[PDB]
Amino acid sequence: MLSTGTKSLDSLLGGGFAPGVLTQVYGPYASGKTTLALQTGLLSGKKVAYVDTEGGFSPERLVQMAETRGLNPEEALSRFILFTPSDFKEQRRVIGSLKKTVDSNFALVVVDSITAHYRAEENRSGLIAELSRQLQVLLWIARKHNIPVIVINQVHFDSRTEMTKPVAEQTLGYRCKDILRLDKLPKPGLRVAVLERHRFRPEGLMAYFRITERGIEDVE
Numbered sequence: 730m731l732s733t734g735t736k737s738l739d740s741l742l743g744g745g746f747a748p749g750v751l752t753q754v755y756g757p758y759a760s761g762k763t764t765l766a767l768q769t770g771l772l773s774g775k776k777v778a779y780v781d782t783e784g785g786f787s788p789e790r791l792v793q794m795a796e797t798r799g800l801n802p803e804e805a806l807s808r809f810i811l812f813t814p815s816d817f818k819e820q821r822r823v824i825g826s827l828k829k830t831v832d833s834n835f836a837l838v839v840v841d842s843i844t845a846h847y848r849a850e851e852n853r854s855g856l857i858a859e860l861s862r863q864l865q866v867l868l869w870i871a872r873k874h875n876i877p878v879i880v881i882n883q884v885h886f887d888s889r890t891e892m893t894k895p896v897a898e899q900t901l902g903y904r905c906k907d908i909l910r911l912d913k914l915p916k917p918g919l920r921v922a923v924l925e926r927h928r929f930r931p932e933g934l935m936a937y938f939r940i941t942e943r944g945i946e947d948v949e
Contacts, residue, residue: 731837731877733765734772734798736947737936741924745769746837746877747907750928751868755882755896756911761920761940762881765911766839767791768944769879771798771805775836780812780823785841785881794944810835817846824863831870838870841881857901864904880905897926919948 730744739745746752754762763785770777771794779786788806795805814820871878887898895910908926918940924932937948
């Protein structure tokens with residue numbers, strides 16, 4: 730398991746993110762999903778392939794996080810191999826490229842994210858297979874290197890049964906064996922993660938944490 734650097738999140742997850750599987754981490758902005766990604770990558774100590782289509786990655790934030798934990802920010806920042814497909818086109822190309830870019834030097838892959846394009850109506854029909862293309866390539870990458878692939882997305886949309894509770898789009902949903910929902914508590918920086926889906930850890934369980942200058946910490 731790839732530790733989150735948080736006692737609660739690790740307890741909830743059986744130790745950290747699982748190698749060889751896609752863990753979806755979804756929630757609203759500032760929910761702490763990106764910080765979680767940054768922290769897991771930072772503490773792994775090896776390279777992190779980070780596909781940032783949403784511009785959610787912040788060098789300064791990682792530097793802050795690295796320093797505040799006495800880690801040497803230059804090396805930390807250097808371990809983050811970035812990809813900025815951003816206009817959601819070279820995205821699949823980037824993920825495809827990842828097949829050969831990712832080697833045994835990598836400890837983690839992070840995709841952020843893939844779920845908002847110009848032609849709005851898109852969402853239903855067609856494109857859905859292209860998403861499956863990507864997810865499959867990511868699962869392939871995760872399995873060949875036995876490392877975790879964190880898939881970050883925004884909350885509320887893909888669970889159209891009726892009670893969109895809350896995001897899990899069928900096969901695409903089951904594409905991710907582990908699923909963590911991050912919610913905001915009404916106190917500055919206060920959050921809770923809910924393990925909605927996991928392979929062996931009890932589901933529905935939660936872990937409270939707070940977003941601080943050091944990244945993400947266990948609550949007081």
